Scaffold this motif. Structure first.
Motif, PDB file in Angstrom:
ATOM      1  N   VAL A  93       0.762  -1.499  -0.124  1.00 21.23           N
ATOM      2  CA  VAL A  93       0.155  -0.052   0.477  1.00 21.23           C
ATOM      3  C   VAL A  93       0.992   1.660   0.056  1.00 21.23           C
ATOM      4  O   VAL A  93       0.277   2.297  -0.060  1.00 21.23           O
ATOM      5  N   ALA A  94       2.001   1.244   0.257  1.00 23.14           N
ATOM      6  CA  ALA A  94       3.133   2.322   0.638  1.00 23.14           C
ATOM      7  C   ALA A  94       4.397   1.758   0.282  1.00 23.14           C
ATOM      8  O   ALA A  94       4.630   1.069   1.054  1.00 23.14           O
ATOM      9  N   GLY A  95       5.019   2.912   0.791  1.00 22.86           N
ATOM     10  CA  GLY A  95       6.676   2.654   1.246  1.00 22.86           C
ATOM     11  C   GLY A  95       7.556   4.378   1.477  1.00 22.86           C
ATOM     12  O   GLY A  95       6.857   5.554   1.514  1.00 22.86           O
ATOM     13  N   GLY A  96       8.512   3.487   1.963  1.00 22.16           N
ATOM     14  CA  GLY A  96       9.435   4.582   2.762  1.00 22.16           C
ATOM     15  C   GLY A  96      11.134   4.984   2.716  1.00 22.16           C
ATOM     16  O   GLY A  96      10.941   3.552   2.076  1.00 22.16           O
ATOM     17  N   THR A  97      11.332   6.032   2.934  1.00 20.97           N
ATOM     18  CA  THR A  97      12.441   5.725   2.832  1.00 20.97           C
ATOM     19  C   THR A  97      13.426   6.357   4.461  1.00 20.97           C
ATOM     20  O   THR A  97      12.994   7.278   4.891  1.00 20.97           O
TER      21      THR A  97
END
Lengths: 117, 118
Positions: A93-97
């Protein structure tokens, strides 16, 4: 390189921990007393605060998980890595760093996160 | 969003500036006096130092350019963006990603860079 993977893993283990007590113990071990977190939705400081922040975040997204994406890397006391948010039914559904900094005693003293689509 | 694009552009403009003098002027304007830079190959501090660092970098990679990749983003005083390293003949040889911090007076006080392959 392995030092960067371990740091990524330790960090995500704290976010994926189901038991709030175990998580305080984890943050207590991995994070520094003078530590600071900030991403586009949140901020926190101190071992307590970060443990509280993670718990609050999880209460809003029950069942979600953070899975590492790609190979963590870095230099000096800096580690960079990315992750994907997985839904209870297994959807991406999404992501980050994140960019994480260790203090001279090996504990996390600073984290700055970003969001990815 | 636009505030983050401007920051990315101002940052890269300094790295792509051909003339050493114009670049001091550019770093003078955009960077803070108490400023710090670190990536996997380099480090510097102060307007002078960063200007010197960029010049040394370019002397080792003459004709190379740094072109923005994707859309910069961020939050608070943080901006994040990525760029590609283009060869004199136009080849994409590599890239990086940076996290830049602005001080309360709008000038760059901290940069942490990382390297990327394809």
């Amino acid at each position: 390189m392995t030092q960067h993977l371990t740091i990524a893993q330790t960090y995500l283990a704290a976010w994926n921990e189901e038991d709030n007590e175990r998580r305080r113990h984890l943050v207590g071990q991995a994070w520094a007393e003078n530590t600071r977190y900030v991403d586009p939705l949140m901020q926190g400081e101190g071992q307590q605060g970060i443990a509280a922040m993670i718990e609050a975040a999880r209460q809003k997204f029950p069942g979600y998980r953070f899975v590492l994406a790609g190979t963590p890397d870095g230099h000096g006391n800096f580690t960079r890595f990315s992750w994907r948010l997985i839904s209870p039914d297994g959807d991406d559904v999404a992501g980050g760093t994140d960019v994480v900094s260790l203090n001279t005693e090996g504990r996390i003293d600073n984290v700055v996160g970003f969001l990815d689509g």
